[PDB]
């Protein structure tokens, strides 16, 4: 099973990179988005606590979530 | 669409990671207790008692830890 775990971690790192590039290109404002989403999930609260600077937490937040200020963050 | 595409791929990665770590008998709660002081993602994952697979995945990606055999 260990090859599968390692493979999935590799795919996660690739997705995080792709997500960072795509949201940056769309001018996502993480702090305004996360202020709106923080009460909605544990991931969003954690992402706001890191000021939006932790892309894996930003990604988990968006995947978990009509929020104002989230244009370009999807 | 590029952001939405990445989000779709993320959901597939989370499913596979859950299946793979379960097949590898990952002991999430003990692993996260060992890692919780190491990163914001790990402290958040422990706060959800390991039940939040996206937070578990972010923790493992960000992090000699006891109990983490099969989680990485």
Residue numbers in the entry:
A (entry chain B): 1 to 65, 69 to 77
B (entry chain A): 3 to 65, 69 to 77
From the paper:
The most abundant virulence factor secreted by Hc yeast cells is Calcium Binding Protein 1 (Cbp1), which is absolutely required for macrophage lysis. The mature secreted form of Cbp1 is 78 amino acids in length, has no known domains, and, prior to this work, had only one known homolog in the closely related fungus Paracoccidioides. The Cbp1 structures displayed an alpha-helical dimer arrangement with an intermolecular four-helix bundle fold at the core formed from the 3rd and 4th helices of each monomer, creating a binocular shape, and thus we dubbed this new arrangement as a “binocular” fold. For both Pb03 and H88 Cbp1, the three disulfide bonds present in each monomer orient the alpha helices so that the aromatic residues (Phe12, Phe19, Trp30) are packed in the interior of the protein, creating the hydrophobic core.
